[PDB]
Amino acid sequence: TPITGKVTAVIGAIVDVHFEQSELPAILNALEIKTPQGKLVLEVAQHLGENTVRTIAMDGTEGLVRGEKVLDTGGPISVPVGRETLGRIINVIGEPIDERGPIKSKLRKPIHADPPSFAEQSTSAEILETGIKVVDLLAPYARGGKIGLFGGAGVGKTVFIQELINNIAKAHGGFSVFTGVGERTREGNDLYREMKETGVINLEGESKVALVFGQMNEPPGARARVALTGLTIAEYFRDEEGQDVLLFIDNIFRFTQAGSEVSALLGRIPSAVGYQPTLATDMGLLQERITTTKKGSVTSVQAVYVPADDLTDPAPATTFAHLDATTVLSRGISELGIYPAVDPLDSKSRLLDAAVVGQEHYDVASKVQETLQTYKSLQDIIAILGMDELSEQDKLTVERARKIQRFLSQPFAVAEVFTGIPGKLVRLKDTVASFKAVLEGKYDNIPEHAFYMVGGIEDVVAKAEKLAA
Amino acid sequence: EVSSILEERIKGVSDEANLNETGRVLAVGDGIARVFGLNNIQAEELVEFSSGVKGMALNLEPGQVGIVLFGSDRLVKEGELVKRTGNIVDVPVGPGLLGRVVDALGNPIDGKGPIDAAGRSRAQVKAPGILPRRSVHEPVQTGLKAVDALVPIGRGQRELIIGDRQTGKTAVALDTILNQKRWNNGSDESKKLYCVYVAVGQKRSTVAQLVQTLEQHDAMKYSIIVAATASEAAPLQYLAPFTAASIGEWFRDNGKHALIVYDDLSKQAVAYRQLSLLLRRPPGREAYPGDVFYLHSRLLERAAKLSEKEGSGSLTALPVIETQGGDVSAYIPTNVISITDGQIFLEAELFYKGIRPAINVGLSVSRVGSAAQVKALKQVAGSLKLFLAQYREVAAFAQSDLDASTKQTLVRGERLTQLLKQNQYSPLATEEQVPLIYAGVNGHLDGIELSRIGEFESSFLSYLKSNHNELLTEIREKGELSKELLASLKSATESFVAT
Amino acid sequence: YVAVGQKRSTVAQLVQTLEQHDAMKYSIIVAATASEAAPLQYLAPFTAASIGEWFRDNGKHALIVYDDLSKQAVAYRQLSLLLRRPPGREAYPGDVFYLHSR
Amino acid sequence: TKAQPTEVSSILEERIKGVSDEANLNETGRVLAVGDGIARVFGLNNIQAEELVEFSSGVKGMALNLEPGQVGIVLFGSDRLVKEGELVKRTGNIVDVPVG
Amino acid sequence: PPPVRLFGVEGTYATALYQAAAKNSSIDAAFQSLQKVESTVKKNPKLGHLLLNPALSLKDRNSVIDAIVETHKNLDGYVVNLLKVLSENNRLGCFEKIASDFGVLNDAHNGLLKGTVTSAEPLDPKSFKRIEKALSASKLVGQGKSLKLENVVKPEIKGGLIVELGDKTVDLSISTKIQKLNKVLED
Amino acid sequence: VRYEASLRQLEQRQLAKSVISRVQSELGNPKFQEKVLQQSISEIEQLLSK
């Protein structure tokens, strides 16, 4: 539109425009300042009056000369969606950075979108198996579910997710989305390479995963709207295509973080810790745009870089509200060398109900929880005084628990290189059997190191023989 | 004499240039000045005051522009005339910076004449995209066996060295530079590293010792030193890593392999904290500003192993974080950890308990290390990380584990620990490291009583070279052990061990 | 049953359970999901109370579950900080007690 | 000196022109600071405290801050729908719900 | 938008006055009447130069205004509304501030440009005239834009010269060159 | 060699004080005026070159 303005201020990457026209862009409209760097996309976020909007700048603001011409693009920027977005990596603005040339599309849809209504909902209950034992026992996935991974890098945030992609998405047939906010560039390049190698993308062949990647080098403002862009691609699959979808988001602390950065500049009194006062609302919008409607089921995976593992920091706290399963992974358990490093007393799922996983499973899980909690409870006593100064009943419990802890160690398949141990995949039905036996102490009579880093119950036995030799 | 030449240079300066615009300074102090005018200014321009100090415009506000002084307040004065340099903040880059100490501005604090530099390049430059990257494969050999097996590091690889204050933190990096002296005294450009040592927040005295140390080891001729001492102004310190990385990127964008060691980014955090507070931007978590994550991430991601199409570029990154009495939970450390791939946590307890280098193996990881690792050092390194995490477990419960199996591991483990130790500032050759690891892994080091392990190492190496350096040359080129080489080494190792 | 700050999926599960146990008939669900405006979230408990008061006033006995008041506080925090009144300790407004107490 | 809510150049310029609010702004008012889901309108010089105000965008917003400047109407709406310089018409009812 | 955007501290008031009276086209008239009352304010020493600063009431402020408009029977009417505004906002310290600002905007409408030729000491008129000519000749002064050039005494700078106007300057000073010389012989 | 380098530095700081002596000479002389006239005409030439 010939609606133009000039740049009154450039206070950080929260540029302010002065619309000299009496026509004013509306809130969440987008503006393009044409630069010798290409274009700069800004998005209107406040009207400060006197015909001066205050605009978030999606790209870097190095070199801007005040008074420079602004031209109004109008409305939320509309990304391009389609089957021709399958196997493409798109920039925040949407430009294909995987250089298969400009993505031709049918429908271009606005980045901002409203979340589906309470009327439009469908309640899932279908278990989705992972084949990861600890996951299966404690908090199994579910089709359409919103699963969440807490704990920062120090668990190797990416590594857990990669296993999920390797297992779940090779058996998923519908579309799948990886949207990586603030993802460290080399790891992203690795993922792209791996995906092409595992044929989930083929650039001459077909693709069935699509990619949005936002690198952590990208200016904070860009990082703020990477998520919203991905959600649009997801909406096209969920709704218009109707086909079932997967979704991975790594890392949504970076989404919050980006918001926290802009908040001060925006002109907001920063709430507790430093998070934006609009933290709750912003979290709300994102997490209600990934729901399982009657039009489609989208299984979503959220990765939170918990700052120093303080869950009490408000951003991790507000994530808990929008998740139906969580698998908090602890640095301590990582130090214990357990990969997967999932904390077992800090995992939960709504899918751990006894009518869902069956009473026998629930009973089995119950006993594990009690045993491990006892083991954690006696950690004080164990450290201060020996285990032979514990009760006869307790020393058995402790010995069982030490075995359970080691048993939980399953070789990782995607980290097969890093662990240096060939990976494993263990069926859920098999998992229940294996734990049942361990709880009855049937095969408890062999080294605790035999339980360490192995798959199924049968494998423990064989490795006991190996150790015996 | 030299004075006559300088006077000739003085005769050679005399401008007549028109000033596009000036400003006049308003309220000034807090290392920011508020200037009236500068309406045609570009953002992040460099302005030069009439005190000769230069500053970077940060906040371009309606009717005023707020410079940030890269330089002392004392020099700048109220109502002083600010002249536009007219250029975004750039620093000289080129081939001539090798063997030159420079400060952040690029002034030659070495004083080996005005710097020879091909170009200048903007202080902040966007990191290369996904498509520009290519997975690492070439090694960087640090000369510390642990930091070559337990943590293998490669070309263009982001990695982290974290640990406790002045445990000779610097020495760990110095040894890498020293080890790669013979690779850099090579004629193969690919195996040449041009290493940049960024000294931020360090005593000018300490830096002078470092320079002298480097020139004692005559390593200066392949290396640049950038300096932003503690005395140097906090905004200069803030821009100091970014500027250093630009110089590094010129090498990277020559395709040439390089390394840049940023000592200490923890001091960059304190500097940015100071700057932020003095910009009256609200304090973030742990009172470190909210954009501190962004600051580190933008810096770190400018190091890359560029794809063969885009040049085959490499610029390895080792950034040195000063933990306050350990405890990796701490906002600044965690923020760094998340960016970096791999950590080299160092343990104070082990340092005190005479393990130099004090490489904690519980908290040292390399998250992309094995790709870099040479096949020789994959074969000989038979899950030594696992083995010593069996030693770690064994000694956990030793004080119980009286099982002969545990004891055998303990005997191996303790003895293996002895092999890890290396007298700092004397790094071992890669070729030489291959047999040592063979010996210990293949358990021929139980054949050596713990006390005499140090003797064994030197003697074993002398024996091997004298017996047949043919083997060592072969693994030097092959970088793999054939069944025959492996057997020859097993046989030879048995021969020395016995003797 | 008042559900403040909770996702639609949570609410949907609740209505599914209540209908399963066939009790939705005597239940009223007042909802203000997480997405819905922070002012609406703030306003939601006080208007839930009013709905309850009609029963109470009518002389009938009823019970009001306020899940979660913690999310009301966050909402009032957002609201207060963008009405720019100086915030109380822990960033929750200085008159948060008055609101909750009433 | 200090910032004042009548600094706004459009309000201010009307005052110079000897033009006044004209008391239409006892029951109407023109939005002039908006964004963040919180608006502040100039006018509404009669307005019950805690009243519900029907925004001309069509949203409803309760009013929680009353200033001799600009009465701060907390929007129940969405930003994208809202636009600046809009007129707002007083519902004339303190917030109320159907109860039965 | 109206020529020259200043938007000073209470200069939004000046801007308002400028554009409002610019469309009345009585900006020269306004400016003249404002000058006339400003001068008689300056020449009013008790109050409005000794109670320029406030401490007065709203009502007393109004009554101070009434005396001020009693002195002039030619006072436009936009600046009588401006006086009202100043009374209502109870600012009187930004009376001369607005006067100066409105003046800048006014003389922008006139197209008069300002400059300065700071030197250590005040210099010859022959030099002044030659420089004024030169500056008008140069593209620096546009045509349809007048030049006001003020030599100032700035003994703070010893020797040297700086020509200044249109925020674009040529500084051929002694101090900078001495600085540079010194610096280069400290190399 | 060490003393030689020191002597070169010493010469440079001594000649720095010679600059000070020259500064006092220029600011004394009505070259302070007469070379200002030269600067004036030089700026006239400069500004005419615009």
From Swiss-Prot, chain B:
SUPFAM superfamilies: C-terminal domain of alpha and beta subunits of F1 ATP synthase (SSF47917), N-terminal domain of alpha and beta subunits of F1 ATP synthase (SSF50615), P-loop containing nucleoside triphosphate hydrolases (SSF52540). One of its GO terms (biological process) is proton motive force-driven ATP synthesis. Mitochondrial membrane ATP synthase (F(1)F(0) ATP synthase or Complex V) produces ATP from ADP in the presence of a proton gradient across the membrane which is generated by electron transport complexes of the respiratory chain. F-type ATPases consist of two structural domains, F(1) - containing the extramembraneous catalytic core, and F(0) - containing the membrane proton channel, linked together by a central stalk and a peripheral stalk. During catalysis, ATP synthesis in the catalytic domain of F(1) is coupled via a rotary mechanism of the central stalk subunits to proton translocation. It is found in: Mitochondrion inner membrane. Keywords: ATP synthesis, ATP-binding, CF(1), Hydrogen ion transport, Ion transport, Membrane, Mitochondrion, Mitochondrion inner membrane, Nucleotide-binding, Phosphoprotein, Transit peptide, Transport. Present with 41500 molecules/cell in log phase SD medium. ATP binds at G163, D164, R165, Q166, T167, G168, K169, T170. Coiled coil: none annotated. This is ATP synthase subunit alpha, mitochondrial. Signal peptide: none annotated. The modification Phosphoserine is found at S14, S135.
UniProtKB/Swiss-Prot annotation, chain C:
Coiled coil: none annotated. Changing G52D: In ATP1-2; growth-defect. It is found in: Mitochondrion inner membrane. Belongs to the ATPase alpha/beta chains family. This is ATP synthase subunit alpha, mitochondrial. Mitochondrial membrane ATP synthase (F(1)F(0) ATP synthase or Complex V) produces ATP from ADP in the presence of a proton gradient across the membrane which is generated by electron transport complexes of the respiratory chain. F-type ATPases consist of two structural domains, F(1) - containing the extramembraneous catalytic core, and F(0) - containing the membrane proton channel, linked together by a central stalk and a peripheral stalk. During catalysis, ATP synthesis in the catalytic domain of F(1) is coupled via a rotary mechanism of the central stalk subunits to proton translocation. Present with 41500 molecules/cell in log phase SD medium. F-type ATPases have 2 components, CF(1) - the catalytic core - and CF(0) - the membrane proton channel. CF(1) has five subunits: alpha(3), beta(3), gamma(1), delta(1), epsilon(1). CF(0) has three main subunits: a, b and c. It comes from the Eukaryota. The chain holds residues 240 to 341 of 545 of the full protein.
UniProtKB/Swiss-Prot annotation, chain E:
SUPFAM superfamilies: N-terminal domain of the delta subunit of the F1F0-ATP synthase. GO terms for biological process: proton motive force-driven ATP synthesis; proton motive force-driven mitochondrial ATP synthesis. It holds the Pfam family OSCP. InterPro entries: ATP_synth_OSCP/delta_N_sf, ATPase_OSCP/d_CS, ATPase_OSCP/dsu. Keywords: ATP synthesis, Hydrogen ion transport, Ion transport, Membrane, Mitochondrion, Mitochondrion inner membrane, Transit peptide, Transport. It is found in: Mitochondrion; Mitochondrion inner membrane. GO terms for cellular component: mitochondrial inner membrane; mitochondrion; proton-transporting ATP synthase complex. Present with 32400 molecules/cell in log phase SD medium. HAMAP family: ATP_synth_delta_bact (MF_01416). NCBIfam families: ATP_synt_delta. Mitochondrial membrane ATP synthase (F(1)F(0) ATP synthase or Complex V) produces ATP from ADP in the presence of a proton gradient across the membrane which is generated by electron transport complexes of the respiratory chain. F-type ATPases consist of two structural domains, F(1) - containing the extramembraneous catalytic core and F(0) - containing the membrane proton channel, linked together by a central stalk and a peripheral stalk. During catalysis, ATP synthesis in the catalytic domain of F(1) is coupled via a rotary mechanism of the central stalk subunits to proton translocation. Belongs to the ATPase delta chain family.
UniProtKB/Swiss-Prot annotation, chain F:
It is found in: Mitochondrion; Mitochondrion inner membrane. Present with 12900 molecules/cell in log phase SD medium. F-type ATPases have 2 components, CF(1) - the catalytic core - and CF(0) - the membrane proton channel. In yeast, the dimeric form of ATP synthase consists of 17 polypeptides: alpha, beta, gamma, delta, epsilon, 4 (B), 5 (OSCP), 6 (A), 8, 9 (C), d, E (Tim11), f, g, h, i/j and k. Mitochondrial membrane ATP synthase (F(1)F(0) ATP synthase or Complex V) produces ATP from ADP in the presence of a proton gradient across the membrane which is generated by electron transport complexes of the respiratory chain. F-type ATPases consist of two structural domains, F(1) - containing the extramembraneous catalytic core, and F(0) - containing the membrane proton channel, linked together by a central stalk and a peripheral stalk. During catalysis, ATP synthesis in the catalytic domain of F(1) is coupled via a rotary mechanism of the central stalk subunits to proton translocation. This is ATP synthase subunit 4, mitochondrial. The chain holds residues 193 to 242 of 244 of the full protein. Belongs to the eukaryotic ATPase B chain family. It comes from the Eukaryota. It comes from Saccharomyces cerevisiae (strain ATCC 204508 / S288c) (Baker's yeast).
